Amino acid sequence: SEQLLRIDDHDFSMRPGFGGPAIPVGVDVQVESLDSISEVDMDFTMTLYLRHYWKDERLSFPSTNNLSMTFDGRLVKKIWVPDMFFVHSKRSFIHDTTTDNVMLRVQPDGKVLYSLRVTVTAMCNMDFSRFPLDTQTCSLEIESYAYTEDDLMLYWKKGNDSLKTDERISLSQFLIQEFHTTTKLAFYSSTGWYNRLYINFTLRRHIFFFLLQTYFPATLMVMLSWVSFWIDRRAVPARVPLGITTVLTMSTIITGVNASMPRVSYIKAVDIYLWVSFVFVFLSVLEYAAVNYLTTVQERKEQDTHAIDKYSRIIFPAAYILFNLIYWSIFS
Amino acid sequence: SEQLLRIDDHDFSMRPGFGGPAIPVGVDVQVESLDSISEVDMDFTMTLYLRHYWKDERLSFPSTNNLSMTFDGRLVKKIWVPDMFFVHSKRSFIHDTTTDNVMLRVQPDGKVLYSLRVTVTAMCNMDFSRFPLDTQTCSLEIESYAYTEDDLMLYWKKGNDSLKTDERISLSQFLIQEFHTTTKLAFYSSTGWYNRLYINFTLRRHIFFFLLQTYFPATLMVMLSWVSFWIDRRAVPARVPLGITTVLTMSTIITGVNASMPRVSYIKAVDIYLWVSFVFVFLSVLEYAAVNYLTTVQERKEQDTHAIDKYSRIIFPAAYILFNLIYWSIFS
Amino acid sequence: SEQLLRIDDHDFSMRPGFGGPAIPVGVDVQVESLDSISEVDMDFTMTLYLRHYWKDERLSFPSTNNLSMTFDGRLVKKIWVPDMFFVHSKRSFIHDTTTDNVMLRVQPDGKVLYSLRVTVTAMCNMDFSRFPLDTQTCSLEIESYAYTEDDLMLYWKKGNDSLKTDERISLSQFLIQEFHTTTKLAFYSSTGWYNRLYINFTLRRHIFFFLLQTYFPATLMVMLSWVSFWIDRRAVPARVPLGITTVLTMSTIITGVNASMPRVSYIKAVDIYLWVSFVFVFLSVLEYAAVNYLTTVQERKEQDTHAIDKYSRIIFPAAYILFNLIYWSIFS
Amino acid sequence: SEQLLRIDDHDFSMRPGFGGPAIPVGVDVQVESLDSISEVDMDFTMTLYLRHYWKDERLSFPSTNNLSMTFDGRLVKKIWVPDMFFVHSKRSFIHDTTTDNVMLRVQPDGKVLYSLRVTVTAMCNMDFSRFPLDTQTCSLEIESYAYTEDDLMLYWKKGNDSLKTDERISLSQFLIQEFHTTTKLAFYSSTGWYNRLYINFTLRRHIFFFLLQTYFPATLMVMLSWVSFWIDRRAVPARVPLGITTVLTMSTIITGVNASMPRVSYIKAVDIYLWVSFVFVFLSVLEYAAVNYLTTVQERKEQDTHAIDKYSRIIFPAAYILFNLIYWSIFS
Amino acid sequence: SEQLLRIDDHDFSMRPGFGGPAIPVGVDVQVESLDSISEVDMDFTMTLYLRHYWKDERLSFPSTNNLSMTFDGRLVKKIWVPDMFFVHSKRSFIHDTTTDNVMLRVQPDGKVLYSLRVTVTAMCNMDFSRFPLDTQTCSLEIESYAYTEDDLMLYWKKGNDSLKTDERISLSQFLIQEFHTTTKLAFYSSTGWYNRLYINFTLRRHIFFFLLQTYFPATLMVMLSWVSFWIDRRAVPARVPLGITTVLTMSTIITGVNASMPRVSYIKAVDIYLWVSFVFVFLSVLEYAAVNYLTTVQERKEQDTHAIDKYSRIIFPAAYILFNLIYWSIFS
Ligand SMILES: C[C@]12CC[C@@H]3c4ccc(O)cc4CC[C@H]3[C@@H]1CC[C@@H]2O
Ligand SMILES: C[C@]12CC[C@@H]3c4ccc(O)cc4CC[C@H]3[C@@H]1CC[C@@H]2O
Ligand SMILES: C[C@]12CC[C@@H]3c4ccc(O)cc4CC[C@H]3[C@@H]1CC[C@@H]2O
Ligand SMILES: C[C@]12CC[C@@H]3c4ccc(O)cc4CC[C@H]3[C@@H]1CC[C@@H]2O
Ligand SMILES: C[C@]12CC[C@@H]3c4ccc(O)cc4CC[C@H]3[C@@H]1CC[C@@H]2O
Ligand SMILES: *[C@@H]1O[C@H](CO)[C@@H](O)[C@H](O)[C@H]1NC(C)=O
Ligand SMILES: *[C@@H]1O[C@H](CO)[C@@H](O)[C@H](O)[C@H]1NC(C)=O
Ligand SMILES: *[C@@H]1O[C@H](CO)[C@@H](O)[C@H](O)[C@H]1NC(C)=O
Ligand SMILES: *[C@@H]1O[C@H](CO)[C@@H](O)[C@H](O)[C@H]1NC(C)=O
Ligand SMILES: *[C@@H]1O[C@H](CO)[C@@H](O)[C@H](O)[C@H]1NC(C)=O
Ligand SMILES: CCCCCCCCCC
Ligand SMILES: CCCCCCCCCC
Ligand SMILES: CCCCCCCCCC
Ligand SMILES: CCCCCCCCCC
Ligand SMILES: CCCCCCCCCC
Ligand SMILES: CCCCCCCC
Ligand SMILES: CCCCCCCC
Ligand SMILES: CCCCCCCC
Ligand SMILES: CCCCCCCC
Ligand SMILES: CCCCCCCC
Ligand SMILES: CCCCCCCC
Ligand SMILES: CCCCCCCC
Ligand SMILES: CCCCCC
Ligand SMILES: CCCCCC
Ligand SMILES: CCCCCC
Ligand SMILES: CCCCCC
Ligand SMILES: CCCCCC
Ligand SMILES: CCCCCC
Numbered sequence A, B, C, D, E: 001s002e003q004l005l006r007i008d009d010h011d012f013s014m015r016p017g018f019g020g021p022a023i024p025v026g027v028d029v030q031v032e033s034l035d036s037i038s039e040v041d042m043d044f045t046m047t048l049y050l051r052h053y054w055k056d057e058r059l060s061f062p063s064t065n066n067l068s069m070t071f072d073g074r075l076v077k078k079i080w081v082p083d084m085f086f087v088h089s090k091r092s093f094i095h096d097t098t099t100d101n102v103m104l105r106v107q108p109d110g111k112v113l114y115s116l117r118v119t120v121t122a123m124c125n126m127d128f129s130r131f132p133l134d135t136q137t138c139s140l141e142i143e144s145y146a147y148t149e150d151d152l153m154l155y156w157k158k159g160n161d162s163l164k165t166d167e168r169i170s171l172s173q174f175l176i177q178e179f180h181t182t183t184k185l186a187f188y189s190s191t192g193w194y195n196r197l198y199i200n201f202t203l204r205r206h207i208f209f210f211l212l213q214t215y216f217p218a219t220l221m222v223m224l225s226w227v228s229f230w231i232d233r234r235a236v237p238a239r240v241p242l243g244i245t246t247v248l249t250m251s252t253i254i255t256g257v258n259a260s261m262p263r264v265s266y267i268k269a270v271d272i273y274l275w276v277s278f279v280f281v282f283l284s285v286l287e288y289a290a291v292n293y294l295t296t297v298q299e300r301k302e303q304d305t306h307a308i309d310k311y312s313r314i315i316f317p318a319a320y321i322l323f324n325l326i327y328w329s330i331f332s
């Protein structure tokens, strides 16, 4: 086989067409899976197939018939091939069981297909200010390590038709949508200009799960604190334990939510809602302290419902409704 | 040894029978263990033996007697062998202590057995909507990396008798059952058609553990909230603390369950049961607020059991029974 | 050195005595440490020295005197050596700092000692039904990868004297005892019969730690629930808060134990004890609801201690004693 | 290509200019990302590009025109290159997908550019005494492993213009600022003097997040404990449960904060604030015990507000204000 | 360079002075960092420089002047070097970025310096019975893998001056002190006697952090339980809720401490203190049950402070003081 290719007779340390125009190299990608995601480290992991296409007259071979020849990674060391790398990647590797998952297919005309299977972890900067109502966009980037656009020209072989994605692709914690491709020119002052390829996608959460587990309990506890305004002010051993036990219950709820969340140490939209609800419950405990004190002062001086309860029955609900209208107009 | 095989005289970069019909290659598998499983990453890990069978006249050798010859991984580099890989795998490796766990056995006729020991991690997409009453099915897949069915024909050597599983195979968190084999043809537009082999199995949970730890406590707390309807309405400092302390107790139970569960952020069958029980307890606290208010209004106007308690003693249990009948007809 | 051994003149791809009887190979082991253990993955990790002994006339060398020659891993590649592997192992490796921890010692007669230092992780199936009163037994297994008993005969060189264990060997969470060796013949239908070597040991827990942290608190809370039967039935605002706060306290205890335990999702001996104690406390809350209701009915009809308290003072302790006697006769 | 360079004719085991003055080697760095940080292990991880510049007459080549030649890691093994390493690093690696991310560019004059992409984890000693108001400074260090300043002279090629940082660089838990470069001479008694290069940066936290989650709840609970001084001393079943339930609520808050914090086992500024607030709440429970006892003694002897309440209404708030003024003058 | 050394003319598979006396080899160590520590696995991780010194006449070279020659890891494969390994180590590796961090310096006389940078993880058996007042001692050990003292003699080159430690060495959770060196002879029955080198150090904790977080809260809760003896026995709805809420508060404290501690499943000094404090609080709840029962019996028979309170006011504090004196005389 390797005697028909004239491997011993050519310098394969240099590209096709050296000293002349650039070599055009086309690319396809097939995404096999999304493997995990980390919100505190801000990265994601992906497994894919990567395919390259070009022509080299040094590899043309005589044949009576149109049959191609096929080789593995042991030929790759002896000929020239393109030099792609993944930009902004944290780590990656090429699969090797039961042997190296790499292939070369060569036509009698000297056209080449070069194919490999690979796993990569890449960074994706995330903003959690609107959590849990946030939306994140991420991308994977491809570039030549050593050749500027004067020597190698890199492009998507079929436009957006160059990207395929597995029919069963999913994540346990997110909804994935809107896969599409783009390109852009980039500059490095030590070397010059390069073309870069992009794969783009969007992530979203299951909203009703978070509403049920977080917003609904806090709202129910605020409503229980209002029941106190309808209990007789003479029942001190009933009015006093109800308040402080409601404060304890709101406190344990907020502690459990904090223990369950990812460790992102800045203020988020759900934080604001919980601490405002805590303040409403605290203020209901100050209301009865005022009522009891003034009742006692009148009983002492002088020796039906009090006006403060009458007003609280109206004012506490109205204020909480106003808060909710503003909050949901901000976070939509 | 390696001079009887005519290694220096043949091109082992190409398959047996090249330019003619396909080479048939048979396969056996012996599963040694299931090593771990991840529900948030959606994958499982397995260790196994993989065995391959074929014939190659280039490896036939003269002998007076029927003795075979046996070799290790140092021959594999010099001859031709099949090119299997594990489809949809996240990572894998071949064992190498005290040396490479690889073997080749060759008959005087040129029949070959090729054997190796390997560990693989593979993806298995899971749905947790019915948790803890869910059932999961998983599979492992085997294919040639470079040869279509025009050049290599891949098959199970003995039918379903080709698969063996270790007598002590188990998992700490699941029951495993129904190991069996299948095959299917697959298509890639850049190359053509391939045959693929499958190993299939099913996973189930220990149901009574989850009933005892999750459903039983919530049911007991709902029943304690009903005790209030049988206590004298005049005892305000008894009726009021009982309710709010029952709400606190249900809240700490739900927080502990949430902290213990895998981090799958969508709504599950057990979530529904817990939040409905929370609402039943909240409504029992509103019932006495009504009774106490109306009692106070009559005492003020005018200066035995109340009808609301009489009805609640009947209506709250009946409604919870109706809920349970519907719920268990849905989740079965 | 390597010119006295006639390395260039012999085929070291095949065993001593090929075409004749089997080569006997003796083995010693010295355990250096037990490194970790996992209860949810069901495996353990160990570091050891492994030593092999045999004779090969191809390695005999002329000498005036009884001095042996000593070599490192660079000779191992050029001669024949045995092919041992660890059965049912998850992963393993051979140490290489400051160089490969491998040695060969050769006598003028052609006797060889082959020695290496290695770390291995191996599976050990565990049953936790009796936890914390469980006992586990584990073993490590050694075998030839390619040679049946017709070609290689594997044995412990000195009987049980072949195994040594480090004087400071320990685990943070277990007591280790009863190290001993065994052997057994095993069969594979594709190849034939093999002899296998075993190292065996036993694991146990610190019982009084678990009694103090788990059984003692639950027993104290059951006894506090009984104090209620000695408090005046007229004190409704005292009898009612005591019960529901005891239920809350038992609930937080059980939640903490569940959060601390390994994630084995089936029912264990300690689970049974905790949920029976929870039911005893719940039933003490139903007792006073009956007493208060019937007292109120008589006061209404008609307009000293009640018999139900008198009987409960005797019956609740007797029943709990009976439960404990049965339980400890079952789990011993 | 490699025949124009006279690789076979020169000893590339030794530096340019050996037996004469030192070889000057210039350096640039481009930071691609900060990848993670650990507060308990005291280290950080970074990915970067590293570039080296020097001249070697042995690599000058004849040409009619000013075109450079470009090579990969397969030339690096055959010529001389500098020997940089990262001082005080825990681990590091050079990227290799789809091939080694290493490049050599050579001019006809014999000037060389040597470039590679690398990930490193480095130690950064941290002090948490002022947490959460702490500020940390970290640095990365570069040096030659084998050559003193008598043989190799190492320097930043353009001053502070030699360092570039990615426009999207960020961390989930910190604010990063003030990237700048320095150099310093270092001494080893076994070999001599070396020049070392430094990259320096500063880290800070989001202060208002920690104020909201930690300081605000403790302050609200101290204020609720003061409400008791305004409730009638005759209401024993109201005054007594309020105190002990406030103590319980402060206790659960402190436990949640401790469970959420990194495991640094020495006293921190936020610890001091929480335990002082706990003591204020405890002392409010002792105040009413005194009032109730003395009231009972007078009622017994003899058979309006008490002076202790009157004074507590003034003294407890004044003392807590004084504490806050001192504390915030210390931690600023 | 490598032609002045007569590499092709000498057998570097054997030591200097073979068939004669032993080769003396001297050693220095420079500790760069302590990298982490694990209390449940019982090990620690360290990074260091290791340096070796010896003489070999086969490496003497002619020179007019006193200049040494310097080489990297590519010479190490061709000559003889010592064979050190780290005894009782779990894992280790040698650094390789931007190339292998290994160096050889050779004098014209044939004296050699051999130097490398390395990271190692080593076991250190720990006892936690006195926690948090425990003290731990650890050591790292160095030995030849293949040569007994008849062939190689290993020693510290300068006594205790052979060990240096970095001026900024620290751990987040411990105080480190008392670094010093020792040596000892060791015996293996299969080979003979070897000399071993030791590096020794000591670890201690920050005591006042643990006192503040663990012992102080439990002591305050015991003192609050005593307040009950000073409240009027007629106030049943005050005396009864105070006790059971104090029991709940002690229970949540102990649960939080247990959740925060390393998972060492045997009894520790701090365990004893917490469960004794729990028993004191339980006994204060039994005291009032007795007082209330006997008061009720006298009121029934017959139809000021009770003696049991009078005695409890003295006896409970005295007993707790006695316990503390004994406990701190035991744990010091
Ligand atoms: C602020 C809290 C303590 C400090 C915790 C912390 C501390 C350090 C850090 O880097 C992240 C976090 C995230 C969760 C934080 C906690 C959430 C609740 C708790 O009060
Ligand atoms: C919804 C909760 C907070 C957010 C938690 C979270 C947050 C992010 C995420 O990716 C997964 C989870 C799983 C558990 C969730 C928690 C369960 C209880 C808590 O209220
Ligand atoms: C059953 C609980 C929720 C589900 C938890 C779980 C869920 C899934 C799983 O694989 C293991 C475990 C172990 C601990 C379990 C918890 C123990 C307490 C809690 O109620
Ligand atoms: C001191 C606590 C128990 C011991 C815990 C521990 C124990 C050992 C250790 O190395 C670190 C820590 C950090 C958190 C500590 C806990 C914080 C709260 C708890 O009381
Ligand atoms: C004993 C507890 C349950 C069992 C827990 C366990 C269980 C198994 C194990 O190997 C270690 C530990 C450490 C912490 C233990 C817990 C401490 C508190 C809890 O009650
Ligand atoms: C196909 O191959 C035949 C030789 O068998 C050749 O004559 C013909 O030109 C080829 N056609 C193409 C399109 O390559
Ligand atoms: C077995 O080997 C003998 C030679 O010893 C040969 O004559 C015979 O044909 C062989 N039989 C088979 C079935 O291979
Ligand atoms: C020991 O070596 C001597 C040669 O020095 C030899 O004569 C003698 O037979 C040897 N003895 C044994 C037991 O090997
Ligand atoms: C550029 O190259 C030309 C040859 O094409 C040469 O004559 C000229 O001197 C070069 N100039 C520089 C600045 O190198
Ligand atoms: C130093 O080198 C000179 C040669 O330049 C030599 O004559 C002299 O003896 C050497 N001295 C020592 C102490 O090695
Ligand atoms: C299953 C969806 C439950 C949604 C509850 C939302 C509550 C929000 C209260 C403001
Ligand atoms: C040991 C099995 C316990 C099962 C309890 C199930 C309770 C379900 C209540 C609806
Ligand atoms: C230190 C040992 C403590 C043992 C307590 C066991 C309590 C069991 C109650 C049934
Ligand atoms: C969103 C910022 C909230 C800051 C609260 C600070 C409270 C401090 C009390 C002393
Ligand atoms: C900051 C140091 C605090 C020490 C408190 C110790 C309390 C011990 C009570 C027995
Ligand atoms: C917390 C609200 C207090 C309102 C007091 C009104 C006095 C007239
Ligand atoms: C909630 C505020 C009540 C204010 C009442 C004022 C009555 C004069
Ligand atoms: C639980 C609903 C009770 C409704 C009572 C209506 C009495 C007229
Ligand atoms: C605990 C059961 C008490 C039953 C009392 C029956 C009195 C007639
Ligand atoms: C906790 C404060 C007690 C003050 C007592 C004052 C007695 C005159
Ligand atoms: C909080 C201290 C109060 C002291 C009151 C003293 C009255 C004589
Ligand atoms: C705490 C023990 C009190 C014992 C009182 C005995 C009175 C006769
Ligand atoms: C607790 C504050 C009461 C104020 C009454 C006017
Ligand atoms: C708390 C609401 C009471 C309504 C009474 C009609
Ligand atoms: C899927 C929700 C079912 C609810 C049954 C009451
Ligand atoms: C709560 C049930 C009471 C039954 C009285 C007979
Ligand atoms: C609880 C102590 C009371 C002291 C009264 C003077
Ligand atoms: C709860 C036990 C009371 C005993 C009275 C003598």
Ligand SMILES: [Cl-]
Pocket (backbone or CB within 6 Å): A237, B237, C237, D237, E237
């Ligand atoms: Cl009352």
